[PDB]
Structure formats: structure tokens, C-alpha cells
Design a binder for this molecule. Structure first.
Ligand SMILES: *[O-]C1=C(C2=[C][C]=[C][C]=[C]2)[C]=[C][C]=C1C1=NC2=[C]C(C([N])=[N+])=C(Cl)[C]=C2[N]1
Ligand SMILES: [Ca+2]
Ligand SMILES: [Cl-]
Length: 223
């Protein structure tokens, strides 16, 4: 997260770190046994780390659980990143409490101007790499479809939306991918891609979760 602030330990109880010996992507807990992340964060040997704040120190509240299976969306297109969503089932259910809680799936899509909270352990520099130890937060609004398409002509599908600041300076970045964009307490986006980080007129693009609720529910119900 570039230009964001320290969330404060466990104030984002649904945030998870996907770990394969280092933190590589974020995710969101949606029930005690499933996490939603982005398709391009897929890999084998994933350990989901819940209740984290400093990812380099065991401070207490952490729950480390192995993924039993990862389900990348069947129509995921690695070239366009269209349908960039993945569900991860945990080997055992997580013990939920105040520090580890799930976030709700939306019932409707959000409108432009909605203010949302984006978090993660991704890079904090737009020019260079500086990864933080604790979780960072950023409040950012959803942009209009016209501004998003004007910024990324030909690359935005109906399963994507832009959120951010066109002036640059504040944005999500590498390491944040797969994590949550929460608006009014509902998970509305998944950090997916963008041109650089915090560059002027190049906001972040997020997977539009409202378009996948039936798919998430049907898939969870059959697995
Ligand atoms: O997410 C990544 C990755 C990556 C993806 C999956 C596993 C390991 C690494 C590599 C390089 C860049 C990114 C990335 N940059 C970036 C920028 C923005 C942005 N400008 N807002 C967003 Cl939303 C998402 C990502 N991911
Ligand atoms: Ca820790
Ligand atoms: Cl277009």
C-alpha cells in the first residue's frame, strides 16, 4: 500500500496473508473454512495465515492453516486478468473471534464515489521496493466507469472497477494482490492489477465481487 497508514493490530480481522515461505498475496476470510483471493496468486503449497499484524513476528492471535484446495475461476484469463478470483478451502476451520472474523459478500454492487478500505503488506514505494512488517490501510473511492476506461482503454471488462486517486500517491501495489476492498462492511473488490503503483491517472483495478456471489456460493456449496 503506497501513501496509506498502519491499520493497528487486528483491526482488519478478515485479512489473511498467503504464505509459501514468504508473504506473496493477500486474501479475505468469508466463512471459517474459505478464503477469497485473486486467481493470479494461485500456486501450490499455500499456507493461509490469519490473525496477523507483524508478518515477521509471532505476536499471538495467529492461526496458520494449510489450504486443502484452491479453485481458480474456470474462465480466468491470465492475459486479460478477466475473472481474476480464486477461492481457497482451508484444511481445518479457523476459530473465529474478535481478531479473526469473516467479511460479508455484497448483495448489490457499489457505486462510484463509495469510500472503501484497502489493506495489505504490499510494497509501500511506487518507485523501488520497501515491504512493511505490519498491515497497511488506505481509504479509497470507487471511480466512475468512464474514468476507469479512459485510464485503461480496451482493458476494463464488466468484472473490473477502478478505485483510487488519479493524482497518484496513494494506491495498492505488489504484495497487496488478492486482498480486500471493503465498502460499507461488504467485500466489493479484490486487488488485481494496475500500471505501476500510485502513478498519476493509473488507478488500481479490482475484481468486481458482486458479479461472482452466485458462483462463490454454488462453488462452496458443492465443495
Ligand atoms: O500482484 C503483483 C504481483 C504478484 C502477483 C501474484 C503473486 C506474486 C506477485 C507481481 C507484480 C505486481 C503485482 C501487482 N501490482 C499491482 C498494482 C496494483 C495497483 N496499481 N493498484 C494493483 Cl490493484 C495490484 C497489483 N499487483
Ligand atoms: Ca505475526
Ligand atoms: Cl473501452
Amino acid at each position: 500500500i503506497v501513501g496509506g497508514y498502519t491499520c493497528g493490530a487486528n483491526t482488519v480481522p478478515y485479512q489473511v496473508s498467503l504464505n509459501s515461505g514468504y508473504h506473496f498475496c493477500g486474501g479475505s476470510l468469508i466463512n471459517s473454512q474459505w478464503v477469497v483471493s485473486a486467481a493470479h496468486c494461485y500456486k501450490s503449497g499455500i499456507q493461509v495465515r490469519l490473525g496477523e499484524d507483524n508478518i515477521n513476528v509471532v505476536e499471538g492471535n495467529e492461526q496458520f492453516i494449510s489450504a486443502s484446495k484452491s479453485i481458480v475461476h474456470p474462465s480466468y484469463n491470465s492475459n486479460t486478468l478477466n475473472n481474476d478470483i480464486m477461492l481457497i478451502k482451508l484444511k481445518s476451520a479457523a476459530s473465529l473471534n474478535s481478531r479473526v472474523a469473516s467479511i460479508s459478500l455484497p448483495t448489490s454492487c457499489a457505486s462510484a464515489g463509495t469510500q472503501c478500505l484497502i489493506s495489505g503488506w504490499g510494497n509501500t514505494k511506487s518507485s523501488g521496493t520497501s515491504y512493511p512488517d505490519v498491515l497497511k490501510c488506505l481509504k479509497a473511492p470507487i471511480l466512475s466507469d468512464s474514468s476507469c476506461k479512459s485510464a485503461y482503454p480496451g482493458q476494463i471488462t464488466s468484472n473490473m472497477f477502478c478505485a483510487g486517486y488519479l493524482e497518484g500517491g496513494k494506491d495498492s501495489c505488489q504484495g497487496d494482490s488478492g486482498g480486500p476492498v471493503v465498502c460499507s462492511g461488504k467485500l466489493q473488490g479484490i486487488v488485481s492489477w494496475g500500471s505501476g503503483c500510485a502513478q498519476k491517472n493509473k488507478p488500481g483495478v479490482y475484481t468486481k465481487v458482486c458479479n461472482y456471489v452466485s458462483w462463490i456460493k454454488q462453488t462452496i456449496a458443492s465443495n
